[PDB]
Amino acid sequence: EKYIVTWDMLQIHARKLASRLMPSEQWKGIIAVSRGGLVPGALLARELGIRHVDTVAISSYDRELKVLKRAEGDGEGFIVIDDLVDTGGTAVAIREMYPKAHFVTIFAKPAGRPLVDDYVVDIPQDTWIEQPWDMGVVFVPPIS
Amino acid sequence: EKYIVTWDMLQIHARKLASRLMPSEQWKGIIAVSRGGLVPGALLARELGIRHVDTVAISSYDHDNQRELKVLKRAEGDGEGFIVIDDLVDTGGTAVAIREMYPKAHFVTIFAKPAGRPLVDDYVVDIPQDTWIEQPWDMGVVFVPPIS
Amino acid sequence: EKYIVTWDMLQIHARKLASRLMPSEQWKGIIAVSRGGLVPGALLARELGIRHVDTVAISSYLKVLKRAEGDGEGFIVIDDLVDTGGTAVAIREMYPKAHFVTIFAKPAGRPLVDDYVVDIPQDTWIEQPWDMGVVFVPPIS
Amino acid sequence: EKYIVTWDMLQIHARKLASRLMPSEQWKGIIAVSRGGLVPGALLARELGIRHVDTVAISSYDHDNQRELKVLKRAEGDGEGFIVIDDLVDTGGTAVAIREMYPKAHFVTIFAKPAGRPLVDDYVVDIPQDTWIEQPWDMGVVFVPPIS
Numbered sequence A: 001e002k003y004i005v006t007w008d009m010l011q012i013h014a015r016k017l018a019s020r021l022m023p024s025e026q027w028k029g030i031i032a033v034s035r036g037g038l039v040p041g042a043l044l045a046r047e048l049g050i051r052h053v054d055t056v057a058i059s060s061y062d063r064e065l066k067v068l069k070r071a072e073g074d075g076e077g078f079i080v081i082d083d084l085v086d087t088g089g090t091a092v093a094i095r096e097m098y099p100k101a102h103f104v105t106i107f108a109k110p111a112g113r114p115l116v117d118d119y120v121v122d123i124p125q126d127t128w129i130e131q132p133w134d135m136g137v138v139f140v141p142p143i144s
Numbered sequence B, D: 001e002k003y004i005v006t007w008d009m010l011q012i013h014a015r016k017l018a019s020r021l022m023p024s025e026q027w028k029g030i031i032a033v034s035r036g037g038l039v040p041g042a043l044l045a046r047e048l049g050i051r052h053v054d055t056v057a058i059s060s061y062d063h064d065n066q067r068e069l070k071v072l073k074r075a076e077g078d079g080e081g082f083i084v085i086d087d088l089v090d091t092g093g094t095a096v097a098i099r100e101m102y103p104k105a106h107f108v109t110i111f112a113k114p115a116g117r118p119l120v121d122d123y124v125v126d127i128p129q130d131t132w133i134e135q136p137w138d139m140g141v142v143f144v145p146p147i148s
Numbered sequence C: 001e002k003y004i005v006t007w008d009m010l011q012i013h014a015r016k017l018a019s020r021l022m023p024s025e026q027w028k029g030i031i032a033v034s035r036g037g038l039v040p041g042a043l044l045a046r047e048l049g050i051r052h053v054d055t056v057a058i059s060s061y062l063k064v065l066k067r068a069e070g071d072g073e074g075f076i077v078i079d080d081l082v083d084t085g086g087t088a089v090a091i092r093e094m095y096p097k098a099h100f101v102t103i104f105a106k107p108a109g110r111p112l113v114d115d116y117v118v119d120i121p122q123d124t125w126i127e128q129p130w131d132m133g134v135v136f137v138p139p140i141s
């Protein structure tokens, strides 16, 4: 099955997570995991009024990890966000990089659920989540 | 507890309901329940290629514990070969009335709460009795202040 | 060359048109032209608080599949757009006393309507929201 | 003058800019300006298939007739082989500072007003100086009371 996520729905979930991150004073910045957490991170930054938004770029070599770009620090007083958590192969690396960081996501599948500190929506392990940035509004033929 | 429904999601449900209503040659037209069934009806008409769309206007003023139903405009026939569609069915008050006017019609809705679930021939999404549904036509994209 | 109209935008135009139809009390009902004017007519009916909504289905074969009764006194005949106006002429005859309005309007059909909201070139194709959907689009790379 | 920008429209504009940036192989990475350039920069990274996305956060502050700038965080290099992006350019003041930080960087934005149009290497939509561009992230879909 394919789970369709629209910009509107994503923004609704992002605001729900943003409320659980109150007060805003308890945070110094947001570390968005490229590229999935870029949009979700931008939404939290706005809702919380956080101007310090850094990123972490990680690539896969095949399974090895290749930290393209790394945000400084140990993650203390920061929020690390990615769009979803499927298994935790990427989250595990993010965890050890920023042990003191508050790792959050929007969607979370059963296998990766225990790796995150907080998430908004539960998605079945066998469901593909189609994010709004991978879609667009185009002509769709009539069924009849 | 509110269930937000955007235009994009409504259209997805409408297209899922249209696929069940195939073929389209078995329908003579569509009767939309004004005003809630107008958009869903317009969507089905497009997907099915049906140009014959009509309406049935029903005014419902609630007085304490009793409803004052009033059919303003009425489509004709027994509903035979037609598709009567509304947006949702809460208690079934409007549904029972419609079913009475068009007994031979295939009554369908996009959403359906438990109370009215047994009163429709087909629907797409299940909704809890205590949950209110915010339709797209009652909403709009506007400025929303930051949480912080 | 195409003109993409998203539901959000179509709704904004419908509201701008609704404010021009104020007061709501000066109307008896709305006659939506099937199928293009169904969604726009539904939006006006929501804003103006009009529960009396009817339809009129013409046909290209001219052919009046179904029609509302009367000359349109106190009613509003609505459609989504007016390209040439060949369909607007037929509506003018069926409902003479009706206030004909549309969302979009091209040069050739502008004089045929009483009011509209957006101006579209004669060469531009208006891709309506009901003919579209949110689907996966491959990366440009 | 209020200019409304929905999520869909922003994505349409972003893809148009992405097509002009081809081939993607000529870029080493994208530097997004917090916070306005974050969403557009994330959209280009998707279309161009670029995983290297960094940022530069500059906090502005106004004191009557003078602006106080503060770099909260900054990317490395002169911006060589990089695409620095922001959502829009109002007076170009913010852009002039970035042009000084990243001289060899390809600076682009989605929208552009007259006062800052010459400061950007490339943009998509032209917006009047007296028009307020309401962005998607600052909006939401909520209940809107009827006109009557």
Ligand SMILES: Nc1nc2c(ncn2[C@@H]2O[C@H](COP(=O)(O)O)[C@@H](O)[C@H]2O)c(=O)[nH]1
Binding pocket: B036, B086, B087, B088, B089, B090, B091, B092, B093, B094, B095, B116, B131, B132, B133, B134, B135, B138
């Ligand atoms: N927008 C909206 N209208 C509702 C909802 N529940 C009931 N209604 C209104 O009440 C009618 C259903 O009432 P019923 O006849 O099923 O008791 C609907 O046609 C609709 O006009 C809801 O959750 N959302």
Ligand SMILES: Nc1nc2c(ncn2[C@@H]2O[C@H](COP(=O)(O)O)[C@@H](O)[C@H]2O)c(=O)[nH]1
Binding pocket: D036, D086, D088, D089, D090, D091, D092, D093, D094, D095, D116, D131, D132, D133, D134, D135, D138
């Ligand atoms: N949402 C929104 N922000 C604006 C608008 N005009 C200016 N801004 C804010 O001010 C900055 C541009 O200021 P500049 O330095 O170009 O005068 C933008 O990056 C943005 O943060 C507008 O029309 N809409």
